[PDB]
């Protein structure tokens, strides 16, 4: 019996971790699609954004 | 601060849902771009990541 | 061993920021891939989803 406001924190962490999974997969999807351009980061000529878990 | 923590949770929750919308849309975009390959997950040859709730 | 909550909020916020960066970059990637169609949103014939302010 704890979790007073941390119940919203736990649900959010679940959402974040899950969303990250989708985002990273989307990133792999984009890097796959833009392999000819060296990946999506290179294709966009921008610094690469990574997950930090 | 307590009230600050509540506000932080509130905004972050709103940020999560907003981001999730962009992510899901990006996912639909990727699925469209790889529809012929069965979607981005099948194209990626990976277990698909979903974001529900 | 005290106040993990307040700290968790900051950690989560940065996680969201980090993720948003990837998501936005992915969106730019998708818009680039569908530039001829006016971006992924228009390519998907959907209302564009955006990140918070
Ligand atoms: Cl994404």
From Swiss-Prot, chains A, B, C:
It is a single-pass membrane protein. Disulfide bonds join 41-48. A motif (CKS-17) lies at residues 24-40. Glycans are attached at residue 53. A motif (CX6CC) lies at residues 41-49. It is found in: Cell membrane. This is Transmembrane protein.
